[PDB]
């Protein structure tokens, strides 16, 4: 299918957008985000509508759509 574009918002209000397929495991997004922030992945928690995103959550499981937001907080 098509990529959807998600906005990942940091604690400092910075944004990195990610294109993922509906079947992508979101661990891949978490890894890339942590890499680009220069911090360990396990130091961060990733929330969708306030709910914790699991490594093996997919956008399809979470009901995500184009331009949905992920928030990142410290673990």
């Amino acid at each position: 299918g098509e990529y959807i574009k998600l906005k990942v918002i940091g604690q400092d209000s910075s944004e990195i957008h990610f294109k993922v397929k509906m079947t992508t495991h979101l661990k891949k997004l978490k890894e890339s985000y942590a890499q680009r922030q220069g911090v360990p992945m396990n130091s961060l928690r990733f929330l969708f509508e306030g709910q914790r995103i699991a490594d093996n959550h997919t956008p399809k499981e979470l009901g995500m759509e184009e331009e949905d937001v992920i928030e990142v907080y410290q673990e």
């Binding site: 910075s14 944004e15 990195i16 990610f18 294109k19 397929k21 890339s32």
Partner: peptide, 15 residues
């Protein structure tokens, strides 16, 4: 800040 969009995408082995 500029926009940032990241795309999340054996027999040859020698080790």
């Amino acid at each position: 800040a500029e926009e940032r969009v990241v795309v999340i995408s054996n027999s040859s082995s020698r080790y």
